[PDB]
Amino acid sequence: DSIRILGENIKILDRSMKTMMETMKLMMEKVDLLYASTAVGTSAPMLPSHPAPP
Amino acid sequence: DSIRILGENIKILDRSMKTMMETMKLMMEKVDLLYAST
Amino acid sequence: DSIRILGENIKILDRSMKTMMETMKLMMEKVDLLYAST
Amino acid sequence: DSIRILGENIKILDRSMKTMMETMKLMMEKVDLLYAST
Amino acid sequence: INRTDQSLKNPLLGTEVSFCLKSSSLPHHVRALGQIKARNLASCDYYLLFRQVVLPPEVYPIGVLIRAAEAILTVIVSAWKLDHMTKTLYSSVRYALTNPRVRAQLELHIAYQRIVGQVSYSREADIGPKRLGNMSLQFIQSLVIATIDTTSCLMTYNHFLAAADTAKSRCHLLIASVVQGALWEQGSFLDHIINMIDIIDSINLPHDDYFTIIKSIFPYSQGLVMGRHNVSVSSDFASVFAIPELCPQLDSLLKKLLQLDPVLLLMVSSVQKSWYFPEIRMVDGSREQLHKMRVELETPQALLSYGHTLLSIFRAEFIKGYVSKNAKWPPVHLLPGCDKSIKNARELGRWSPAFDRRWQLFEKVVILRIADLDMDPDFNDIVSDKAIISSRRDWVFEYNAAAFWKKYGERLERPPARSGPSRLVNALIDGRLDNIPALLEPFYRGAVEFEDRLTVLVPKEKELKVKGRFFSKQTLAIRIYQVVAEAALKNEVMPYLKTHSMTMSSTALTHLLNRLSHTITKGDSFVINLDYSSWCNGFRPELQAPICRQLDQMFNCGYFFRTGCTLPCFTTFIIQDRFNPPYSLSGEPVEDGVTCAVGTKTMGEGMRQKLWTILTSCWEIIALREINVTFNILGQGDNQTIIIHKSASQNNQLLAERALGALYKHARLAGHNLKVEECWVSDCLYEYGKKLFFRGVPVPGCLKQLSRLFPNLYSKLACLTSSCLSAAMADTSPWVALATGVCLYLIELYVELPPAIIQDESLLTTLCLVGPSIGGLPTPATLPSVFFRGMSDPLPFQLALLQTLIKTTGVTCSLVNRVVKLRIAPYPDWLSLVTDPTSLNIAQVYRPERQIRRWIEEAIATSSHSSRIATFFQQPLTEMAQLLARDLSTMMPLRPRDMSALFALSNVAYGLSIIDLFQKSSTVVSASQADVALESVRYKESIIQGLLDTTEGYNMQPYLEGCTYLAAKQLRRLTWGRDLVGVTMPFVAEQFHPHSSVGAKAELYLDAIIYCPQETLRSHHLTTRGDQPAANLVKDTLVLHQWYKVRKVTDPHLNTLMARFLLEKGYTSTGYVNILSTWLRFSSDYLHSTIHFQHVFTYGCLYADSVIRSGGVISTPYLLSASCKTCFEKIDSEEFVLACEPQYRGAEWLIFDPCVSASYCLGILIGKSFLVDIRASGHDIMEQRTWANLERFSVSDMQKLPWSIVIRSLWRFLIGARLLQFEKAGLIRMLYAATGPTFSFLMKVFQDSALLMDCAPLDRLSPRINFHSRGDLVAKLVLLPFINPGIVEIEVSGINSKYHAVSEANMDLYIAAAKSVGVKPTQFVEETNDFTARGHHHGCYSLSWSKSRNQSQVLKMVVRKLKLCVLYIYPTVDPAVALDLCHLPALTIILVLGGDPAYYERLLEMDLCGAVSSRVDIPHSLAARTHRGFAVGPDAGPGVIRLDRLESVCYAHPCLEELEFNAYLDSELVDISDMCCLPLATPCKALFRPIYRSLQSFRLALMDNYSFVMDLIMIRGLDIRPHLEEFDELLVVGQHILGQPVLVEVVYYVGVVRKRPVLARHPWSADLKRITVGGRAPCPSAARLRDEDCQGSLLVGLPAGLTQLLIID
Ligand SMILES: [Zn+2]
Ligand SMILES: [Zn+2]
């Protein structure tokens, strides 16, 4: 039982992480579209938005 | 093997959080240069 | 025994996350209505 | 050795969380002053 | 080489001519300026010139063509045996080719083609003046000068090509129109076509208005049709266009066409390319394109919000589909605030219906990873000729240096050669695609390098838009990204979208389309036709970013899709308009808003073609759901059809109005402003797959379709035949297609070959009749697939055609040899055979190029510098393929069908597919072939020389007489040398000889097939419906191995070979005729002989169609008798002993008795079939599709199984199922009736009375139940479980658990094992009560219940008195009476059926013994129209037996108590007083033994029915009145036996009181339902049972309620 009392804890830690995922992804949608909207007609480079494949 | 698999899961959770690090750090220049335009 | 001391540290850890959680939400709204009021 | 490495893992998690916090406080003010900019 | 095109394939650009006119200083300009006249027109008005071209009449001698076409059509039709239509066909061809206007158009086409040929692919820069009648064409480099008169129209070569294509299209249109009109009820509509041509050619309006008119012709015609014929939903589509305000003559002509026939109007209006194409106004077109790629119809905030909503609905649909396909939710993470309903549904792995209306609840559901992005596309997508730009630095290679210099004053810094390839195949060859995951890595990051951020827009050719539509050519990296994304979406995501998923499964599409066709006519499902115009230049990043993010998460490809969703904002766009280049600042294009544009909101046409489809389905579903309608969104392109079903409370008009309002609202939110110009609702016209459908029936595409490497005659003819074959595959009639194809083929031959060949009528005919199967040019004639749909051997057809030609026409066999020039190859080429099972082993001289497969492979293997190619060609694939084919050649009983099957599922087959896909690319062939100009000249010279030699080929005399089946067998024997067998299939026309039943002899009827027309057919019926009906190779090999083991082949060679394949993969352990067919009831009663049968059926229907279209009419049924006996081979499959051990090795570098089991399976299969049938309503029963294809079975196979086993299995399944009242009631009502794949097919299986008496359940049950017809006995037998538990629970004892476990996935497997169990039972012949002069009166008489009892007995007694041996019975006689007469021994019955077996079929169905089948002569009965000798049924005539009913019974016959009739024969009375009853023996079931002399048997039946009625009363909602009537019949019999009076009417009160059945004549409870039964009469059969001592025994032990009902108070 002592192994599952924290097993749920890990899940809620994971769930908080998953909620964190969506939270910024909404930020990343907005920020990207701001930058893209200001790119038309300019030489603005293509800054990445994801670090790299594993 | 529950302990080993949960250790692996928390490891991949660490890696995802380092990806969180790099993405947020990556937005830095994107927002910053946006100021520089103005 | 030694597993007891690694429990409460998670308790405060989550309370740090919870205390962190509203930090996003209270700024979720303020970064949201930035976009509409634009 | 599993418990020891698990403890080191928790420690690196806590320090990475300190890094998250300090980079956020390096974020919140800069994002907020954009409101004063508009 | 200059002028390297023979057909229009590029947009009609005009900038080049403008540049050369005023600018430019090249030498050609000096000559060009010299030849222009004072009134020099502009290229934009080129069509205004070519319309004035007139040729002198009768310039090209073609009468030879007319005669040759006549002969060819005559020969083809005569071979098909539809001779009577030869007149129509060849008269139509002659009329088409003799009309002055048509001939003028044809000559113009010929002149244009000759001119094109003489200049195209030439090396000379300039070609002297060429006369085109009154024109004076002159060619300079790539420019053309037209000088009809003192007027000049200097134009580009593409303009001249467009003019030539227009002339050719008009020729096709005219010929097709004439032929088509010749085969109608409303024929001869050519005049209207010519009038339209003149009207259009008389238009002098400006360029833009003219092309607007031409473009609007078709939508305006659709609007005209809809407005007049819409019945429920209004329409205004016609009013939107400006044709009447611009060209009134055209409007009047179109309205006249509508008044004539809507289908004609739609067909004529379909053509949209027989009118000159426009010169795209690049200056304005490009500007508007760029502007439309950056306009914002909605604020990005609203677009993002609506994108979130679309993400919600997308999640909902995906979850629904996944649950429906896997019964479990995907891996999802519920955000905080998730609705408890979603949580519960996820926990239970279900899908509550409430979600569909509450998609918003899914905003809190996030889908986790479900798969991984397949960053390794298969070669099929990569190997393509789609043009691409290697990188940014190549942008300077899409413009003319001189024009750039003249437009800016500075040179264009082009490097000497392009920095990379120009087409995707070249890129793959160069090794640039060997590391795709690394190539797409920047996309994963989201930072596509600068070098791959350029797109070149290309105007699209052959489109009637003045401002043109541009399709984008992307960089190599972007193309690979597009391919990967499209593959991922179409494979892992798109299928799971439930609502959209039912838009690509052809089964679902076909079912939905059939439902729409059947439902639209009456009107309960109108269709909304969405047609987005700005779709391609639509979607903005905001709208799609949410779904992009969701997809990214689902595929665990971080910021991959979103990369493409925001990419175009950082892309440079340039218009591919040479002679108008953008300025070059630092080696990069500079934005100007006309030629170049840096960054745009959309990515342009041809990108994310799937994602946009998903989004469109999403918002359409959102729009329609909120108005609570029933939609079936259908379509994939910018045009989509929405099907809306009728609502029970709103007329279709209001429903359509609300749907249109909702769609407008919910498409505006998506930045896709929708206009009335592209939205119409109708219940008459609906378009899908570029095919109009008027009132359900498809609109013929004859007019349109028939109007559609280095050049060569073979390629042109092949394209012609393929186009005509596709048109025929469409609803286009085969005859119009064939005639038009023959005419066009003759024209094409006329264009190329010299006069020495053309002016030889016999040679031209023979050449046109020699197909490719025998080694000739592809011709429309030799195409058996024109009419049929499935595979067909072409060789017998070719031989039959040649045979008919030799027999009829004056052509001699020597000429056939001369034309054919058979040349058997020196050595067998097994690879070709395995690729084409039906082909001969001959040298295809006219093939443009053979053995090029090795040449392509060798060129690819070397000069590659790649990695994927190297590992894909590490040794010659062709050699290994030849080795594998030679290995497969050892099949002792050669079966090239199997070889092709076995060869197909091998890696080398995939390799050959890749190689010949490489060959498909245009210039990669030139890369291997390294110029063509000589080849084209060489090829022509070769064929021209070919058709001169008088030297014969292999003598064909022996292979032209006799049956063509034997001829094909012998030919294959000769051309391969070891007796190929198993693929030749007969030619239906030879196999069957249609005949009219009006005149036909018995010898003609022995073997034949019946065709019964329900009513007189005519031209109306032809167009109106009637009433009558990867690793996957692993799975393929597994199923094939099962299919083999079950055939019982267990050969070590095959086992090892298949295991080798599996370890290589890693495993280790019609349409055109159905409409008419619906008016034909079909039968087969010869029992001789798959897929080829469908060919025979289609041939019969074709005979009907021909005899109608020839002006005739069919009233009497017709036949298709068997003619060529030798064509009926007796097939007996043998083993595939491979003989020599297989040597192919492997590649690995590419990429209890079955009767019981079957009987139990049949029982359960039938049980579930009934279970699904009961659910279906009246509107869902017309479909004959049983649960799982229960129909494709023979009759003998079923009769092999002991029917007792099946009956027990079905009974056990039924009792085990134990359905509640509703289903039981549905079964009872429908089984007493008969509908659908139900008791119908049961009765279909149970004609043979042998099964009935031999059915163990029935014989025991026969004395227990009473029936009235064979259609009631079977129903009682199959309903026994729920009516008579007394016996069913006795036979339920038999059971076996392992039999239950027998899965149905292998249902056909047990049938095959039981194919040859033994021999079916016999029929026996049970007797009827006979009479003799000296006999004993036993009192038994057949048909006791029937009123015709006395009549039937009198006829029997008369027959026996007359000692007749042969008797004729007309259909007028009572069916029961004839049956009784049939049962008489030592008598032959000849029904006067006149070729209609309905009456005879009825007699068989009623009878329960073999008397009818044994004593009724079928060959004579179907061949008899009037009686010959003694007959019954006529009121008068020689030998006619007549019964005159006596007014008063004046005689008491010893056998018949009252003689109610007097027998007369040819006006002479027949004395029958001395006749007496014959000793009776085992009687037939027609005597109704179930109720026998033994009253205890009647007691058993009465008690059983009483119990059944009591059980029925407990069934709520069941109409019990029908059953009570049969029970009352037994009650009347019992009352007669007891002596009680037989009341005419009796009132019964029925109901459930205190949970018990009640059936009482007196109402003792208010809840009892009163039911009155009238017409009750005492049954004379009950008289025999009315024994005085038998009265008491009846009531002993009977139920009190039954006793009360029997006794009348
Ligand atoms: Zn034959
Ligand atoms: Zn019978």
Does residue A34 sit at the E interface (CB-CB below 8 Å)? no
Q: What is the rounded CA–CA span in Å between residue E284 and residue E1575?
A: 89
Interchain contact A36–B (C-beta under 8 A) = no
Which ligand is nearest to the Cα of residue E1249, counting in written order? 2
Give the closest of D7, D10, D28 to C27, CB-based: D28
| Within-domain flag for A18 | yes
Q: Which of E335, E568, E749, E746 is nearest to A19 (CA)?
A: E335
Is C35 part of the contact surface with chain E (CB cutoff 8 Å)? yes
Length of chain C, in residues: 38
Of C6, C9, C31, the CB nearest to D31: C31
DSSP states of E1488-1535 as a string? -TTS-S-HHHHHHHHHHHHHHHHHHHTSTT---HHHHHHHHHHHHHHH
- Cross-strand pairs, E1081: E1012
Q: Could you tell me if A31 lies within 8 Å of chain B, comparing CB atoms?
A: yes
E7 CA to middle of ligand 2, Å? 73
Q: Name beta bridge partners: E527.
A: E643, E682
State how far Cα E849 lies from the chain centre. Answer: 35
**Size of chain B in residues:** 38
Q: Is the dihedral of CA E847, E851, E854, E855 positive or negative?
A: negative
- Please state how this structure was obtained: cryo-EM
SS3 letters across E1299-1365: HHCCCHHHHHHHHHHCCCCCCCCCCCCCECCCEECCCCCCCCCCCCCCCCHHHHHHHHHHHHHHCCC
Distance, CA of E1478 to CA of E674 (rounded, Å) = 89
Residue E1389 contacts residue E1382 (beta carbons within 8 Å):
yes
Token pair 């009977």 is found at E1598
List CB contacts of E150: < 8 A, sequence separation 6 or more. Answer: E37, E38, E39
Burial class (CB in 10 A: 0-12, 13-18, 19+), E1395: buried
- Closest-lying ligand to the alpha carbon of E989? 1
Number of Cβ within 10 Å of residue E405's Cβ equals: 14
- Phi first, then psi, for residue E1432 (nearest 5°) are -130, 140
| Minimal-distance CA residue of chain D relative to B13 | D13
C36: chain E residues, CB-CB within 8 Å: 301
Give the Cα separation of E855 and E349 in Å (integer). Answer: 58
Helices (H) and strands (E) in chain C, counts: 1, 0
Distance CA E283, CA E557 (A): 42
DSSP string, E1173-1220: HHHS-GGG-S----TT------SHHHHHS-HHHHHHHHHHHHHHH---
C36 touches E at CB < 8 Å: yes
- Asked if E1314 and E1197 count as a contact pair (C-beta separation under 8 A), the reply is yes
Measured in Å, residue E1407 CA sits from the centre of ligand 2 at 4
Helices (H) and strands (E) in chain E, counts: 69, 31
The DSSP 8-state label assigned to residue E1080 in this structure reads E
E1387 CA to centre of ligand 2 in angstroms: 14
Residue ranges of the alpha helices (H) in E706-793? 713-729, 734-752, 755-758, 761-768
Tokens of E691: 């095919």
Distance E1410 CA to ligand 2 centre (A): 4
Helix (H, G, I), strand (E, B) or coil at E1578: coil
Set of chain D residues whose Cβ sits within 8 Å of the Cβ of C27: 28, 31
Question: DSSP letters of E671-729?
Answer: T----GGGEEEESSEEE-SS-EEETTEEPP-HHHHTT-----HHHHHHHHHHHHHHHHH
DSSP alpha helix (H) spans, E1423-1494 = none
Q: Is residue E137 within a helix (H) or strand (E), and if so which, with residue range?
A: strand E136-140
On the 0-12 / 13-18 / 19+ scale of CB atoms within 10 A, A26 is middle
Q: One-letter amino acid identity for E11?
A: P
Determine whether D37 is exposed, middle or buried from the number of CB atoms within 10 Å of its CB (0-12, 13-18, 19+).
exposed
Q: How far is the C-alpha of E626 from the C-alpha of E648, rounded, in Å? A: 17
**In chain A, what residues touch C19 (CB-CB under 8 Å)?**
none
Containing H/E element for E529?
strand E525-531
Residue E738 contacts residue E76 (beta carbons within 8 Å):
yes
Cβ-contact E276, E163 below 8 angstroms: yes
- For β-strands E525-531 and E639-645, DSSP reports them as antiparallel
Q: CA E1083 → CA E939, E966, E1100, E1108, E1117, distances in Å? A: 53, 29, 12, 21, 11
Neighbour tally for E970: CB within 10 Å: 14
Please give the tally of structural domains in chain C: 1
Tokens of E626: 């909120």
Contact assignment for C30 to D28 by CB distance below 8 Å: no
What SS3 state is found at E482?
helix
CB of E1119 within 8 A of CB of E1010?
Answer: yes
Interchain touch C–B (≥3 Cβ pairs closer than 8 Å): no
Give dist(CA E1294, CA E365) in Å, integer. Answer: 54
Query: Chain C: nearest CA to D3, how far in angstroms?
Result: 9
- Chain E environment of C35 (Cβ under 8 Å): 301
For chain D, list the contacting chains (3+ Cβ pairs, <8 Å): B, C
Distance CA B19, CA B13 (A): 10
Which residue, among E491, E504, E492, E501, has the nearest Cα to E367 in the 3D structure? E492
Beta-carbon separation of D7 and C9 below 8 A: no
- Cα–Cα dist E816/E1368, whole Å: 55
Q: In this structure, which residues have their CB less than 5 angstroms from ion ligand 1?
A: E 963, 990, 1124, 1127
Residues of C whose CB is below 8 A from D34: 34
Q: Tell how strand E1476-1477 and strand E1331-1332 pair up.
A: antiparallel
CA distance E988 to E1127: 10
- DSSP output for E1212-1233: HHHHHH---HHHHHHHHHHHHS
Phi-psi region of E1597 (alpha: psi -120 to 50; beta: other; left: phi over 0): left
Closest by CA to E172, choosing from E716, E748, E786, is: E748
Contact between E486 and E609 (Cβ < 8 Å): yes
| DSSP structure string for E180-241 | HHTTSSS---HHHHHHHHHHHHT--S-HHHHHHHHHHHHHHHHHHHHHHH-SSS---GGGG-
Residue with tokens 């009809």: E148
Q: Is residue A25 part of a domain?
A: yes
**CB–CB contact E445 A50 (8 Å):** yes
- For E1214, what's the count of Cα atoms within 13 Å in the CB-facing half-sphere? 26
Contact predicate E1384/E1356, CB 8 Å: yes
Give the closest ligand to the alpha carbon of residue E1382: 2
What CA–CA distance (Å, rounded) separates E898 from E290? 57
Residue E599 is nearest to which of A29, A41, A47, comparing CB atoms? A41
Token readout for E202 is 């008389």
H helix intervals, E1407-1461: 1411-1415, 1418-1421
Distance CA E242, CA E1521 (A): 66
Contacts of E719 by beta carbon, 8 Å cutoff, 6+ apart: none
C-beta separation of E1104 from E997 below 8 A: no
Question: Whole domain around residue C23: which residue ranges?
Answer: 1-38
Candidates A35, A50, A54; nearest CB to B30: A35
Closest by Cα among E973, E959, E715 to E840:
E973
Taking the C-alpha atoms of residue A33 and residue E541, their distance in angstroms, rounded to an integer, is: 8
- Pairing label, strands E1476-1477, E1468-1469: unpaired
Report the candidate in E62, E75, E58, E69 with the shortest Cα–Cα distance to residue E179: E69
**Chains with 3 or more CB pairs under 8 A to chain C:** A, D, E
- With beta carbons under 8 A apart, name residues in chain E contacting C38: 301
Q: Give the integer Cα–Cα distance in Å for E125 and E26.
A: 13
Does residue E120 contact residue E3 with C-beta atoms inside 8 Å? Answer: yes
**Going by C-beta distance under 8 Å and a sequence separation of 6 or more, which residues neighbour residue E120?**
E3, E4, E5, E6, E711
Nearest Cα neighbor of D20 from C20, B33, A31, A19 is: C20
Distance CA E1025, CA E1078 (A): 6
d(CA E579, CA E401): 8
> Cα(E992) to centroid of ligand 1, in Å?
9
Containing H/E element for E498? helix E498-501
Amino acid in position E19: F
Are residues A47 and B37, on separate chains, in Cβ contact within 8 Å? no
Residue type, E1078: T
User: How do E1388-1391 and E1366-1369 pair as beta strands?
Assistant: parallel
- CA of E959 from ligand 1 middle (Å) equals 13
Tell me how far CA of residue E78 lies from CA of E562, E801, E1271, in angstroms.
Answer: 65, 9, 47
Angle at E655 between CA E649 and CA E656, to 5 degrees: 160
Residue E527, phi then psi, degrees to nearest 5: -125, 135
Report whether E774 contacts E964 (CB < 8 A): no
Tokens 């191995």, residue? E1041
Residue in chain E closest to A15 (alpha carbons) equals E333
Spell out the SS3 assignment of E157-168. Answer: HHHHHHHHHHHH
Note whether A23 contacts E: Cβ–Cβ < 8 A. no
Residue E1163 C-beta-side C-alpha neighbours within 13 Å: 28
For residue D5 the two structure tokens come to 């490495």
> What resolution does the deposited structure have, in angstroms?
3.1
Is residue E126 helix, strand or coil?
Answer: strand
Residue of E nearest to C33 (CA): E301
Q: What share of chain B is helix, strand, coil (3-state, %, to 5)?
A: 95, 0, 5
- Subunits with 3+ Cβ pairs within 8 Å of A are B, C, E
Chain E CB within 8 Å of residue A50 CB: yes
Q: CA E316, CA E489: separation in Å to the nearest integer?
A: 17
